[PDB]
C-alpha cells in the first residue's frame, strides 16, 4: 500500500526503450471500408487476443516472417492477429488487424532480426483460413462494423426540452459533493422524458454512456490513483476498448467482449465482470492466491496490463500488484532487458506448482518504489 509517492514518470513503459531506441516511425493511420472483404496476411507464432487500441511489440527472427514484414511495409503496413479460442491450432473465428507504426531491422547475430511495434485498429471475422505454401497464410477478412447508438431519449424526446440537454462541465474535478450531487441533477434533467415511456429514469441510466464510463472510472480510481483525464478517452468506443484491454480477465471473456459490437453493451459487460471479480488465482493450480482486487496499480498510461516482449520474441501481458502472495524468487535481481526503465526483475514462481507467474521489480535508485512491484503475467492467472 504505497500512496502519494508514485514517482516513476509513468509514460516510458508505453515507449518500449528496451526494444530499441532509434526506432523508425510511420506517418499516420489507415482505413478499411466497412463490411468489405480484404486479403490480410497472418503473422504466426502469436497467440493473444489483441483488443483494438492495444500496443503489441514484436521480435521476429525466422526468414519467412522477416520477408513477410518487409513486403507488408512496402505494400500497406497491416497484418492480422486472430482471436484464438481455447482450442489452439487455428481455431479462431474473430480477430483484429494490427497496423505497424514502429520499425527496425538488425543485422546482428548474422541474422536479419526485425524489431517492430504495432497497434490494433479494426475488428473482423475470418470466413476461411486460407493457407499459403510460403508459410505466411493470408485470410479473407470481413470487416465487422462498429455500432454507435444515439441517446436512448432521442426517440421519445420533447421538442421543447431540447435546449435543456447541454450540461455545464463537471464542477472542479474528482471531488465529493461535486459528483453525487451533480450526477443526481444530471440524471434528473437528462431523462425527464422517461416519464412518457414505461420505465424509470435509473433504468435508462443503466444504459447511458456517460454514466457507465463514470462508474468504471470510479472503480478504477478506487483501484489505482488515476490522473482524472489520464489518457482516458471521452469517446465511449475508445474508453470501452481501453478498459477491456486493462481488465485482468481470462481469455474467454476477452473473446466475448470482442464479440460485442456496441459500446454500451461492452461497458455493461465490463462492469459485470469487474464487479463480480475479486480474486486472481494461479491457473496451473487453481488453489493459491497471488493477488486480490484492490491491489492493482499502473505505471503505464495504458493501464494495469500491457504487452511486452522478452528477448526471445514471446509476448507477455503484465499486471502490476503491490505485494504478491505465495511467490518464491530465484536468481539475483538483474536488469538486462527490464521493460520498466529503472527496475531490476527477479523471476517469481508459484509456491507450489513453481510456474512463471511473473517478476518482482526491485528498485535501483532510492527515490523509487522500494522493491514492491510484482509484474505477474497471464500464463498462469485465472480469475476466481
Amino acid at each position: 500500500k504505497k500512496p502519494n509517492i508514485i514517482n516513476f514518470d509513468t509514460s516510458l513503459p508505453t515507449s518500449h526503450t528496451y526494444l530499441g531506441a532509434d526506432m523508425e516511425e510511420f506517418h499516420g493511420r489507415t482505413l478499411h471500408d466497412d463490411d468489405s472483404c480484404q486479403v490480410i496476411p497472418v503473422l504466426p507464432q502469436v497467440m493473444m487476443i489483441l483488443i483494438p487500441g492495444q500496443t503489441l511489440p514484436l521480435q521476429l527472427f525466422h526468414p519467412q516472417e522477416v520477408s513477410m514484414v518487409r513486403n507488408l511495409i512496402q505494400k500497406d503496413r497491416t497484418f492480422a492477429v486472430l482471436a484464438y479460442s481455447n482450442v489452439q491450432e487455428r481455431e479462431a473465428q474473430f480477430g483484429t488487424t494490427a497496423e505497424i507504426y514502429a520499425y527496425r531491422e538488425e543485422q546482428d547475430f548474422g541474422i536479419e532480426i526485425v524489431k517492430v511495434k504495432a497497434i490494433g485498429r479494426q475488428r473482423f471475422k475470418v470466413l476461411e483460413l486460407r493457407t499459403q505454401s510460403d508459410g505466411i497464410q493470408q485470410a479473407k477478412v470481413q470487416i465487422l462494423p462498429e455500432c454507435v447508438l444515439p441517446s436512448t431519449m432521442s426517440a421519445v424526446q420533447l421538442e421543447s426540452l431540447n435546449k435543456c440537454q447541454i450540461f455545464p462541465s463537471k464542477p472542479v474535478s474528482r471531488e465529493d459533493q461535486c459528483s453525487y450531487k451533480w450526477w443526481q441533477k444530471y440524471q434528473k434533467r437528462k431523462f425527464h422524458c422517461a416519464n412518457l415511456t414505461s420505465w424509470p429514469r435509473w433504468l435508462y441510466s443503466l444504459y447511458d454512456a456517460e454514466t457507465l464510463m463514470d462508474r468504471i472510472k470510479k472503480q478504477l480510481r478506487e483501484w489505482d490513483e488515476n490522473l482524472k483525464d489520464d489518457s482516458l478517452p471521452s469517446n465511449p468506443i475508445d474508453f470501452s476498448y481501453r478498459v477491456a484491454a486493462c481488465l485482468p480477465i481470462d481469455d474467454v471473456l476477452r473473446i466475448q467482449l470482442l464479440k460485442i459490437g456496441s459500446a454500451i453493451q461492452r461497458l455493461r459487460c465490463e462492469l459485470d465482470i469487474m464487479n463480480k471479480c475479486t480474486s486472481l488465482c494461479c491457473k496451473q493450480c487453481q488453489e493459491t492466491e497471488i493477488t486480490t482486487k484492490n491491489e492493482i496499480f499502473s505505471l503505464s498510461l495504458c493501464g494495469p496490463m500491457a504487452a511486452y516482449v522478452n528477448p526471445h520474441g514471446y509476448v507477455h501481458e503484465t499486471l502490476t500488484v503491490y505485494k504478491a502472495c505465495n511467490l518464491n524468487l530465484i536468481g539475483r535481481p538483474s536488469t538486462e532487458h527490464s521493460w520498466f526503465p529503472g527496475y531490476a526483475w527477479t523471476v517469481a514462481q508459484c509456491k507450489i506448482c513453481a510456474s512463471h507467474i511473473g517478476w518482482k521489480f526491485t528498485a535501483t535508485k532510492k527515490d523509487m518504489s522500494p522493491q514492491k512491484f510484482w509484474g505477474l503475467t497471464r500464463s498462469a492467472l485465472l480469475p476466481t
Partner: protein, 1127 residues
C-alpha cells in the same frame, strides 16, 4: 412469411407545435396544429375554433412556420419532416374543393453527419429571404427562398461552435443576421453572425460575444422598434442589443424553467411564457424611453398569470384567447381576463381538447357488452395523469341545436291536422310547462291554449279522438286538437297532487301518493274507468300498448315490480329484484319482436325481464350497468324497428338482433332527458336535452371512438383488471418534496391522498430540503363509478415496476401480484426487491404474501398457474404452495435483463432494451427452461409481443416496427437457433405497449374474415394502432393495389410512400417488407370515380378459380369495406 396488415384505429392527439396566421385567406385568422403526421387547420372565431381541414402527411412534422414572401396575398407553410423532407405548401380553395398544393419540395438530408443533440432547429428570415436549418453539428444549412428554387437546393455554412443551444434570426437588420447561444469550456456565450447569400458564408455580427448565464436556454427575437434579443435562463432574463443591456432575476420563475414562449403583441410589447410544471408567465417590455424618436427598453417586469396544463407550445389567438397546446396533458383554450381575479388567477378555461398520450399502459375489458372490447389506458403524466376509456359507439349527428336552461322533460306535440308531422314540442321545467313550436328552424315558444304556463306537467302527448291531453299535477286536462280549445278536464278523484302519470293511446293511469286512477279516452270526455290503491308509494308507472293487458308499478321502499289488470286493481304478477333504491323508471316494449319489460333504478342499473303478449310473466333476469345517474328510458320509432334509448350519465341504445339485447353506447357525454321527433326540418330524428343545452339530430354509423376520462392528478404507471372483484388495480406515483422535518409533504391533492380507505406498507424484511421524492401507490378503482376504493402506499425508496392480476395454483382466490425494487440514489443497480401478493376482498386490501428477492422485478406473467418473474437478468418460476407462500421451482440465467416477458402456451419471449430478443421453452417433463432461438442486434427496443407461435412483433428505434420469425422446419441447427427477420415498417410512432384484443364485436361469422388475430398498440403521441395477419394471396393483392394507389393518390409535400414507410435508422435504412399500410388501403375509398378506374385495370382479382382480368371496381370496394369493418 409474415404478411401483416397494420392500421390506425385512432389518430394521434398530442400536439407538438401550433402556429397562427392568415393561411386560408388574407382576412381569416387560422390556427394550424401538427399532432404528428396530421396537420389540422382551424379558423379562430368569437365562439371558438371551427375546423377547416385535416390533412395527413407522409412524415412526422419536426418544424413548421408560416411565412409570406413579397407578392403573396396569404401565408405559405414550410414543413420539414423528421426524415428531412422539406416542403412549402399553399392553401387553395374553389368553392367546395379544398386543396393544399405543394409549392416546393425536396429532401435536405446530408450524406454524412451526426444529427444535433439539441435537435432540428428551423428558422425563417423575418424579411422572407432565406430558411435556416440546424440539422447537424457544426453546419448551418441555408435554403435560399426564391421563386425559381422549386427543388429547395441548400448549402452548408461552417459553424465553428459545435454546441449550439438556440439560434434565431434578428428583427430589423438590413441584411440577414442570426443570434445564438453556444457552449464552451469557459461557459455559455451569445454571438451573432451576418449570413451572406452571395458569398455563401457568415460575416461579422453587429454586436460581439457577451457572456451570459450558465443555464441560458432560449433566445427570443424582439421585433421592431426594440430589436435585439432576450435570453431566458433558469434564474434571470436578459435583454441584449449591443450597447443596450438589461438583466433581471425575479424570484417567481426560480421554481421551474421556462420551455415555451409566444409573442402576443405585433410590436412585441408583451410576451407569454410557459414552464415545465405548467404555469403561465407574462413578460412585459416598457417603451417609456423615447429620446429622439428611438424606442428603447426600460424594464423587464414579469407577471404570473395562473396555472394551466403542462404546455409544450403556446399560442395567442385573438381577443385574449390562448391555445395551450399540451403533449403529455390535454390541450386547452383559456382566457386572459385581467379583471376576473377570482382568487388570484388571471386565466379561466373555455374548452378542453382530448389527448390520449402518452399511453403508458392499456388493457382490454368487456365492461358493458359481452363480446365487444373496451380499452382502458393510462394516459398523461404528473398532474394530468388519468384513466381513459375508449369505446366504439353509435355517434349521433346533430342537425339543429338550440340551447335550453336544463329542461327536465320534453314531449313531441302536434298543433296541425293529422299528417304524421309534429311541428311542436312541449317542454317541462321544474314547475313550469313551456311549449315551443318549430315548423322549420324556429325556436320561439308560445304557450299552448290547453295547458297553463306553469303547472308541473308530467305527460303531454297526442290524445285520442283527434285531441291533445296536457296533463298536470292538479288534474288531467285534454284540449281538442283542431279547435285548439279545452273539451274536458277531469280533476283527481283524491283531490291531491299527481306525481307520476302515464298515458297510452286509449287508457291512462295516473297515480298520486299510493292511489291511482284508470281513465278511458273518450271524444271530448275523460271517462274514468276505475280506481285502485297501492300498499306502498307509487315510485313509477307505465302502460305500454289500445288497452294494455298489464300495468307497471314500483314501490318506493320495497322496490318490487307489480303488474296488474289495466281496468281494475286485480294483480297479475309481481317480482322483486334486489331493490337497493327506488326504481327511477320502468317501461315495456317489443324491440326484440317480443314483449319485454325493463326497469332502471336510481343507481343507473337496469334489470331486463320477459313478459307474455296475452298474459303471463317471465323472468329474463339480467343486470346491466348503464351509468351512475338515473336513467330515463324512452322509445323512439325512428329506428330499426323500435330500439330503446337509455339516457343516463352514459347513454345507451338497446337493440336486439334475434334474442340478445345488445347495447350501443351513444357517443355523448350526457343526455339526461330524450325524446323522438318527426318535425319537417328534421324528419325521423331525436331531440335530446342535455344538462347544459339541447339538440335535435339523427344517428350515424359506428365510425366513432369515444374517450371518457377519470383524472387521478398523478402519473399512472401500470393497470390491470380483476373480474371477480369488478375492480381495476392501477399503479401510480406522486411527487412529494422533502421538507425540513424528516417527512415528505405532498404538492397537490392526488388520487392516493383522496381514497376511501388507505394503507401504508409495513415490512421489516431489511435528504436535502427541496429534493423531490417519488411515492408509489397501488390504487383499487371501481369499474362502474371509477372512484378510488383503496390506495396502498409502499415503503420508502421502493419503486414498484410491474403488476399482474391472476390466480395461482389450486387456490380459488384471485390476487394482485406486484413486483418492486428498493432503489437508492447512492447505488446505480438495485440489489434487492420484493414480490408482494395482495388480495382485495370486502373493500379492504390485505397483504397475503411477501417474498424478498435479490434484484429488481422488471416484469411478471402468469405462466400456467405459476408466476414467472424476471429478477434482473434471471428468469425464475414460482409455484403457489398450498400454504399461500411462493416457492422457487426453476431458474434460467441470461446475459440480458429480462425487461420484456411475453408468454403464449409454453413459449417465453424475453427481451431487453438492446433489442436482444430471446426465445425460451419450458419443458414440463423435466421442469427446466431451454433456449430455442435468439436474435441479437444492437438497437433500442420499446416493446415486443407474440403474434403467434412463430411470428413475434416488436417496435424499435426511429419509430419502427419489425417482425421476426423462427423457421422450425429448418434442417440445420444454426438456422433453427436463429430468428429470421421477415418484416420491417416505419410506423412513425413510439409504441409503449402491445395487447391482444379487439374493439369491434367478436363474431365468428362461420366464414370468418381474411384477417387472423388482432393486436393493439399504444403510442406516446396518443395513437392506437391495430395489426392483424393476412394470407399470401390477400397480401399480394393488397401490395399490388398499394403500388397502383401510389401512382394516383397525390400526397401533400410529394413525399413518396415507399420512402416514408421504409425502415429507417440513424445508421441504415431498408424498404418496408411484409407490412401493408392500412391507412393507404383505406384511403382508396375516398378517391374519385375516374381515379377509381385508373387504379384498377389488371389486378387479377378473383382467386377462387379463374382470374377475371377485368377486376371491376366494386370488388375492391367490397374488399376494402371488409378491411374497414375490423376496427
Amino acid at each position: 412469411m409474415s404478411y401483416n396488415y397494420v392500421v390506425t384505429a385512432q389518430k394521434p392527439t398530442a400536439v407538438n407545435g401550433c402556429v397562427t396566421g392568415h393561411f386560408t385567406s388574407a382576412e381569416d385568422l387560422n390556427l394550424l396544429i401538427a399532432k404528428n403526421t396530421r396537420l389540422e387547420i382551424y379558423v379562430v372565431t368569437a365562439e371558438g375554433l371551427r375546423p377547416v381541414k385535416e390533412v395527413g402527411m407522409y412524415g412526422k412534422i419536426a418544424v413548421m412556420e408560416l411565412f409570406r414572401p413579397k407578392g403573396e396575398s396569404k401565408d405559405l407553410l414550410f414543413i420539414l419532416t423528421a426524415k428531412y423532407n422539406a416542403c412549402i405548401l399553399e392553401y387553395k380553395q374553389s368553392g367546395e374543393s379544398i386543396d393544399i398544393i405543394t409549392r416546393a419540395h425536396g429532401n435536405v438530408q446530408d450524406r454524412i453527419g451526426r444529427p444535433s443533440e439539441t435537435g432540428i432547429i428551423g428558422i425563417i428570415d423575418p424579411e422572407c429571404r432565406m430558411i435556416g436549418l440546424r440539422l447537424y453539428d457544426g453546419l448551418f444549412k441555408v435554403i435560399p427562398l426564391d421563386r425559381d428554387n422549386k427543388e429547395l437546393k441548400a448549402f452548408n455554412i461552417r459553424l465553428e461552435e459545435l454546441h449550439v443551444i438556440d439560434v434565431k434570426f434578428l428583427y430589423g437588420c438590413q441584411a440577414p443576421t442570426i443570434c445564438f447561444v453556444y457552449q464552451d469550456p469557459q461557459g455559455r456565450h451569445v454571438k451573432t453572425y451576418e449570413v451572406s447569400l452571395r458569398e455563401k458564408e457568415f460575416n461579422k455580427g453587429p454586436w460581439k460575444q457577451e457572456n451570459v448565464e450558465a443555464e441560458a436556454s432560449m433566445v427570443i427575437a424582439v421585433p421592431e422598434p426594440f430589436g435585439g434579443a432576450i435570453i431566458i435562463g433558469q434564474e434571470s432574463i436578459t435583454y441584449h442589443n449591443g450597447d443596450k443591456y438589461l438583466a433581471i432575476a425575479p424570484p417567481i420563475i426560480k421554481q421551474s424553467t421556462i420551455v415555451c414562449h409566444n409573442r402576443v403583441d405585433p410590436n412585441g410589447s408583451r410576451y407569454l411564457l410557459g414552464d415545465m410544471e405548467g404555469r403561465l408567465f407574462m413578460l412585459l417590455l416598457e417603451k417609456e424611453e423615447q429620446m429622439d424618436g428611438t424606442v428603447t427598453l426600460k424594464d423587464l417586469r414579469v407577471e404570473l398569470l395562473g396555472e394551466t396544463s403542462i404546455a409544450e407550445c403556446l399560442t395567442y389567438l385573438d381577443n385574449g384567447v390562448v391555445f395551450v397546446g399540451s403533449r403529455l396533458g390535454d390541450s386547452q383554450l383559456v382566457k386572459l381576463n385581467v379583471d376576473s381575479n377570482e382568487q388570484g388567477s388571471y386565466v379561466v378555461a373555455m374548452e378542453t381538447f382530448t389527448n390520449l398520450g402518452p399511453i403508458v399502459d392499456m388493457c382490454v375489458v368487456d365492461l358493458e357488452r359481452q363480446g365487444q372490447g373496451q380499452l382502458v389506458t393510462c394516459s398523461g403524466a404528473f398532474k394530468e395523469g388519468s384513466l381513459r376509456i375508449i369505446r366504439n359507439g353509435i355517434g349521433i349527428h346533430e342537425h339543429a341545436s338550440i340551447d335550453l336552461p336544463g329542461i327536465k322533460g320534453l314531449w313531441p306535440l302536434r298543433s296541425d291536422p293529422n299528417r304524421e308531422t309534429d311541428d311542436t314540442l312541449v317542454l317541462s321545467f321544474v314547475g313550469q310547462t313551456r311549449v315551443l313550436m318549430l315548423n322549420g328552424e324556429e325556436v320561439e315558444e308560445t304557450e299552448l291554449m290547453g295547458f297553463v304556463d306553469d303547472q308541473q306537467t308530467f305527460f303531454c302527448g297526442n290524445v285520442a279522438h283527434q285531441q291533445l291531453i296536457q296533463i298536470t299535477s292538479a288534474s288531467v286536462r285534454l284540449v281538442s286538437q283542431e279547435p285548439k280549445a279545452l273539451v274536458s278536464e277531469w280533476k283527481e278523484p283524491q283531490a291531491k297532487n299527481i306525481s307520476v302519470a302515464s298515458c297510452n293511446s286509449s287508457q291512462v293511469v295516473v297515480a298520486v301518493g299510493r292511489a291511482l286512477y284508470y281513465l278511458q279516452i273518450h271524444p271530448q270526455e275523460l271517462r274514468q274507468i276505475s280506481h285502485t290503491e297501492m300498499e306502498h308509494e307509487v315510485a313509477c308507472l307505465d302502460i305500454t300498448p289500445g288497452l294494455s293487458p298489464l300495468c307497471a308499478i314500483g314501490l318506493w321502499t320495497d322496490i318490487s315490480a307489480r303488474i296488474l289488470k289495466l281496468p281494475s286493481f286485480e294483480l297479475l304478477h309481481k317480482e322483486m329484484l334486489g331493490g337497493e333504491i327506488i326504481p327511477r323508471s320502468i317501461l315495456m316494449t317489443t324491440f326484440e319482436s317480443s314483449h319485454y319489460l325493463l326497469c332502471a333504478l336510481g343507481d343507473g342499473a337496469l334489470f331486463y325481464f320477459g313478459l307474455n303478449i296475452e298474459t303471463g310473466l317471465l323472468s329474463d333476469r339480467k343486470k346491466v350497468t348503464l351509468g351512475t345517474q338515473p336513467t330515463v328510458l324512452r322509445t323512439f320509432r325512428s329506428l330499426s324497428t323500435t330500439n330503446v334509448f337509455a339516457c343516463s350519465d352514459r347513454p345507451t341504445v338497446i337493440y336486439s338482433s334475434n334474442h340478445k339485447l345488445v347495447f350501443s353506447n351513444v357517443n355523448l357525454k350526457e343526455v339526461n332527458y330524450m325524446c323522438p321527433l318527426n318535425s319537417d326540418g328534421y324528419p325521423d330524428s331525436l331531440a335530446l336535452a342535455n344538462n347544459s343545452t339541447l339538440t335535435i339530430g339523427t344517428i350515424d354509423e359506428i365510425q366513432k371512438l369515444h374517450i371518457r376520462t377519470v383524472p387521478l392528478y398523478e402519473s399512472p404507471r401500470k393497470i390491470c383488471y380483476q373480474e371477480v372483484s369488478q375492480c381495476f388495480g392501477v399503479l401510480s406515483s406522486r411527487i412529494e418534496v422533502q421538507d425540513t422535518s424528516g417527512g415528505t409533504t405532498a404538492l397537490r391533492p392526488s388520487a392516493s391522498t383522496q381514497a376511501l380507505s388507505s394503507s401504508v406498507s409495513s415490512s421489516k424484511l431489511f435528504t436535502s430540503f427541496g429534493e423531490e421524492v417519488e411515492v408509489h401507490n397501488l390504487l383499487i378503482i371501481d369499474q362502474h363509478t371509477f372512484e378510488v376504493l383503496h390506495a396502498h402506499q409502499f415503503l420508502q425508496n421502493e419503486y414498484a415496476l410491474s403488476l399482474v392480476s391472476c390466480k395461482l395454483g389450486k387456490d380459488p382466490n384471485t390476487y394482485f401480484i406486484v413486483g418492486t425494487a428498493m432503489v437508492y440514489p447512492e447505488e446505480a443497480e438495485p440489489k434487492q426487491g420484493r414480490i408482494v401478493v395482495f388480495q382485495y376482498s370486502d373493500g379492504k386490501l390485505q397483504t397475503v404474501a411477501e417474498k424478498e428477492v435479490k434484484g429488481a422485478v422488471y416484469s411478471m406473467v402468469e405462466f400456467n398457474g405459476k408466476l414467472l418473474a424476471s429478477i434482473n437478468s434471471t428468469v425464475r418460476l414460482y409455484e403457489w404452495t398450498t400454504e399461500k407462500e411462493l416457492r422457487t421451482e426453476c431458474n434460467h440465467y441470461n446475459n440480458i435483463m429480462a425487461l420484456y416477458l411475453k408468454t403464449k402456451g409454453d413459449f417465453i419471449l424475453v427481451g431487453d432494451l438492446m433489442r436482444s430478443v430471446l426465445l425460451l421453452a419450458y419443458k414440463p417433463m423435466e421442469g427446466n427452461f431451454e433456449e430455442i432461438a435468439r436474435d441479437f442486434n444492437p438497437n433500442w427496443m420499446s416493446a415486443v409481443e407474440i403474434l403467434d407461435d412463430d411470428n413475434f412483433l416488436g417496435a424499435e428505434n426511429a419509430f419502427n416496427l419489425f417482425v421476426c420469425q423462427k423457421d422450425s422446419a429448418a434442417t440445420t441447427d444454426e438456422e433453427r437457433q436463429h430468428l429470421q427477420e421477415v418484416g420491417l415498417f416505419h410506423l412513425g410512432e413510439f409504441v409503449n405497449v402491445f395487447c391482444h384484443g379487439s374493439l369491434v364485436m367478436q363474431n365468428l361469422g362461420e366464414t370468418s374474415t381474411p384477417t387472423q388475430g388482432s393486436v393493439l398498440f399504444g403510442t406516446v403521441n396518443g395513437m392506437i394502432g391495430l395489426v392483424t395477419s393476412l394470407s399470401e394471396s390477400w397480401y399480394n393483392l393488397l401490395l399490388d393495389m398499394q403500388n397502383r394507389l401510389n401512382k394516383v393518390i397525390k400526397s401533400v409535400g410529394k413525399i413518396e410512400h415507399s420512402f416514408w414507410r421504409s425502415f429507417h435508422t440513424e445508421r441504415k435504412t431498408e424498404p418496408a417488407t411484409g407490412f401493408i399500410d392500412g391507412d393507404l388501403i383505406e384511403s382508396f375509398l375516398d378517391i374519385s370515380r375516374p381515379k377509381m378506374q385508373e387504379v384498377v385495370a389488371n389486378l387479377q382479382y378473383d382467386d377462387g378459380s379463374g382470374m377475371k382480368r377485368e377486376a371491376t371496381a366494386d370488388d375492391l370496394i367490397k374488399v376494402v369495406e371488409e378491411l374497414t369493418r375490423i376496427h
